[PDB]
Amino acid sequence: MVLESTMVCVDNSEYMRNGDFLPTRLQAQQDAVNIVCHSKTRSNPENNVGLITLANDCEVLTTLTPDTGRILSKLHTVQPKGKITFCTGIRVAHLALKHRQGKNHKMRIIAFVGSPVEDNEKDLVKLAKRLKKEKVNVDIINFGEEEVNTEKLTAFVNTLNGKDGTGSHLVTVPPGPSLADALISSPILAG
Amino acid sequence: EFLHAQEEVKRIQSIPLVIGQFLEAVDQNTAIVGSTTGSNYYVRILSTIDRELLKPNASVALHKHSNALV
Amino acid sequence: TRPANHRQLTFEEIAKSAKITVNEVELLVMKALSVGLVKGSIDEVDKRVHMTWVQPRVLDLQQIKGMKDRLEFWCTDVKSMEMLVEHQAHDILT
Amino acid sequence: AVQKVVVHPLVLLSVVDHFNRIGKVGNQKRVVGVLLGSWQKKVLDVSNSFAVPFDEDDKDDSVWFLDHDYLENMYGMFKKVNARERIVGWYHTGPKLHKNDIAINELMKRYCPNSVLVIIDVKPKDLGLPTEAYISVEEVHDDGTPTSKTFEHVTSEIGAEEAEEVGVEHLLRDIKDTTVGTLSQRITNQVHGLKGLNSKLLDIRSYLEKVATGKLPINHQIIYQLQDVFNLLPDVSLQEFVKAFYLKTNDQMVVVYLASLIRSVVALHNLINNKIANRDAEKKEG
Amino acid sequence: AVDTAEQVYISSLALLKMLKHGRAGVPMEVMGLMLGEFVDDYTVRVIDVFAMPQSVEAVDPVFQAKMLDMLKQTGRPEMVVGWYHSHPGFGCWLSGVDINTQQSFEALSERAVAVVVDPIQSVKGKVVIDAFRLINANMMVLGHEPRQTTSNLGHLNKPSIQALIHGLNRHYYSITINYRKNELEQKMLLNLHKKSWMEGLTLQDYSEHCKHNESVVKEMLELAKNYNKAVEEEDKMTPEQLAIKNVGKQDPKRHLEEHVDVLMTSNIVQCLAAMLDTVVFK
Amino acid sequence: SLGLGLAAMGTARQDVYDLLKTNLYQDDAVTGEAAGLALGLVMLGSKNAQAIEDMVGYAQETQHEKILRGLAVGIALVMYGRMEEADALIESLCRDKDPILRRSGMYTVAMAYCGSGNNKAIRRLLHVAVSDVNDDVRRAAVESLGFILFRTPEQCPSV
Ligand SMILES: [Zn+2]
Fold this sequence. Notes:
Chain F: It comes from Homo sapiens (Human). Chain F: Belongs to the proteasome subunit S1 family. Chain F: PC repeats lie at residues 1-33, 34-68, 70-103, 104-139, 140-159. Chain F: This is 26S proteasome non-ATPase regulatory subunit 1. This is part of a larger assembly, with chains A (191 residues), B (70 residues), C (94 residues), D (286 residues), E (282 residues) and F (159 residues). Helix content of chain B is 10%, strand content 33%. In chain B, a hairpin with a 2-residue loop joins strand 1 (19-27) and strand 2. Chain B has one helix spanning 2-8; strands at 19-27, 30-35, 40-44, 59-61. The longest helix of chain B has 7 residues, at 2-8. By secondary structure, chain B is mostly beta strands. Chain B is globular. Chain B has a four-stranded antiparallel β-sheet, with no helix packed on it. Chain D is an alpha/beta fold. Chain D has eight helices and nine strands. In chain D, the strands form three sheets. Chain D has a five-stranded mixed β-sheet with strand order 4-2-3-1-9, with helices on one face. Chain D starts with a strand and ends with a helix. Chain F has ten helices and no strands. The longest helix of chain F is centred in the middle third of the chain and has 13 residues, at 66-78. The chains are: A alpha/beta (191), B mainly beta (70), C mainly alpha (94), D alpha/beta (286), E alpha/beta (282), F mainly alpha (159). Chains in contact: A-D, B-E, C-D, C-E, D-E, D-F, E-F. At the D-E interface, helix 1, helix 2, helix 4, helix 5 and helix 8 of D face helix 1, helix 2, helix 6, helix 7 and helix 8 of E. Bound molecules: zinc ion. Residues 29, 85, 87, 95, 98 of chain E line the site of zinc ion (ZN).
């Protein structure tokens, strides 16, 4: 029922091309898209969904929209090839949400990161305070090898919601296709 | 201002006028024309028309309402 | 070398610089024109070979210097000579 | 090739209004919209244009946004309202085009066969012709560029139409203009021409001194090509070229001479004409 | 609550959008919305203009809400102030149904404005633009405007006959319109007919130039031939019978100045540009 | 508000001018008459350069017409009979494109040249009388002659 704008950062990098998840990371993150789109759908139809990738030329395949069937059409033949790119992923997800027609919606972002990232903590603190300005609380659910224990991401989050913010969160990527309804059992409205 | 004056007169035509025929002129800037509507009229003319275009009943145009040699 | 002042060079400087006989310089220049690195022409009553076109080559700093000299020397003449126009006609063109 | 385009005066105003729309930011917000034109000929016609949301950061100019959704819907409306109109390219209000500007064309080359750019200038300090447009190509070089890709200058002009000339030129009454001014528009022409010459020379010398010394790339891009510009430089004062002038200039001088000759007599007629009527009406008046 | 001397502020794009729409749909009444801003109780301001499909009854307003929406998100949100359509070759007068949409609209917004346009009667010098404002009939005897200033009364123009034959004061009241011009569009609109230095530095040609002078001089000789006979002729006929027998094929003294003028303006610039091209160049 | 300055017109009441300023800076059409006239009226002959800068600085961004008119008269009244320093403002107002501010400057040159029989201002004043396009600043242009001709009043009916 809350007003927000979900911005998902899918991963069509090369490192998604493996089987640490049971079938494949493609089906894993795809299914997590299935649960997030149904989640926001059942929460509020006024909310809108927009997706982005992390490839060489990180792509807005679906502009921020409440419909999810278009995003489901985009999920297929995703072609997870290339290289995981993070700092420009949060950037393209960043400057995008200032193009919103509806402003009551809170800028939310969820990211599916399943490839080894090469970011820096000063980069995550600069981007983190930049996300302090607009208060874009982002909850990333990692799907595959991401970093050393998702390092530079809990630091990114805490440097985002510093001084007892606790709005953004960081999930884990070591076992498999986590039932995100179980991952957000308590944080069902705000992960 | 005079050149602005000539152009603004041009709105009088707007195309759908009538196809008539010049017949004769009585004096300066006033003549007689027999329209293709079967009848004949006495009319004035515009000062813009060159007076070398006359003679042997030329094809002319006329206003619907006014019926003036334009 | 010569800045197109008198570039209709006679055969002799060619036969000396290339140190070829006089009766071969024509066959050499016709080959060069056949290639297309130059667009000169050939006279025989004087045996002067006129030059028109030279392929653009590489240059350096000093060539940039004298080039800037030509550029300024021409630009200033252009501007001043337009100043002659405006001076000659102030209230005439409105 | 397209080789030239004819842009109507509606656009170049339908961009200014939108630069005015997001013009409250002041600092920088590059205006980008959709260009609409006609598949006229090799030459291309440009009639309509519209806007689209677009933003971009300051550093790392790779973060820019064109709402494909907004483009799809609004152009659907403009096709429903005009199938005669169609997308032809795009524009941006940048006074000087940016390095980012190639990625936009490269993006929307899928809608148009080539979404030609359109650079407009809200403040053309130059009193020449503003709002010039480019179309990108590949010019892979001896250096070993995998894809030497850069835009191309294409000549353009201002469109015209019976109605729009009516409404515009009725609006031109706010200022005075001498378009029928005999032998005045020419003088203005050579004036503004020489002005453009001097401006271009000052620009090229600004670049040339910069590259000559201290800090600028010394590429083989132009450095000899502009030398070939020096190659032409016709040596005006020479032997037979004098016969070029004096064998024609006096020709035109003869015609001018005759024209003055008849003009004087024609002016002389009215002296007799009015000197007759004055005194003949006076003597009969008294 | 009372009327005033109202003013119609415009947008320069609005005019062109009007004339192009009406001209394109010239053989019938073309309809469209007038979009602007209610600046005050005294003046109005229009800034945006657009139309819709019509085969005069407009079709689905789903175009309406989405149109205004996407116009809000790109640019900004604005207010609908009035509307417009065409009276092609007409008396630019509110038609019977045209007034019939007016009780519909003024009931929605108070200062709803009708806009009449004719791309037919408009000559390239001046356009025939128009707009009106419905008036009640219940107050047909009571005063409708206070008339606290000359501008909308003895300072504007005079009602035309072909529209006064329909309302002229009745069922509505006319309204004044002006043009606000941003300096930004003003400067560029100032310069749209100039060219680059190439045009001002062309030398057209001396073969077709000398050929041209050789042309005009030829028939100008004949113009002098006629001029001799005409001037010396002088029937003592009074200065107006000459003006009645000169209509015909008579034309000395007229072409003579013309050919001299053209031959002047050609040779002059033709010499001048050649002069500059040598003084300046090399 | 309109007669407020006309009453205190010779006294040059800075105190009423103060509240008249903020009256003028309401960004409205109903207060434009409230402050626009009395503001300069209570500063008649004052030559308050900050007053000129306030009036001209505010009559550049407005949206109404009365707020342009009251300033158009106030700026023309702030300078009173100088003929030697008002020239920069007369040129600044006549070179404008504002159809009211030119006419505002056209009234100005009349008051800066109250009856001034100077044949200098007569050249360009009575020249923009010729080439002037706006009817407003045209009529205001020709209507400065008698305001600049008490030195020789017999000349108006000849020009
Ligand atoms: Zn109608």
